[PDB]
Point group: C3
Chain length 38, copies 3
């Protein structure tokens, strides 16, 4: 099992990071919207 | 089955990344718009 | 992909790329700050 668990671990860490950036993106898009609007 | 799920999970990761790539390109273009007009 | 070596190789190439997108985003975030700052 080791190869499989090490690749799964890494893919999961990538996926968590992607989720985190999607959140940062939403907040940034909010800020853009405020600069476009006001 | 393992190489199979692995493949599956990488492909999920690769699709996410492309969307990320696309979202980033869209933000930066809005930023340009504001900076130049 | 056929092998763990090759999956990890491709994952690594994503991670390298993503590394670069993060730097670009941070620079963009600073640009928003500047625009907010006015």
């Amino acid at each position: 099992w080791g190869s499989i668990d090490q690749i799964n671990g890494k893919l999961n860490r990538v996926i968590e990071k992607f989720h985190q950036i999607e959140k940062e993106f939403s907040e940034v898009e909010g800020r853009i919207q405020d600069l476009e609007k006001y």
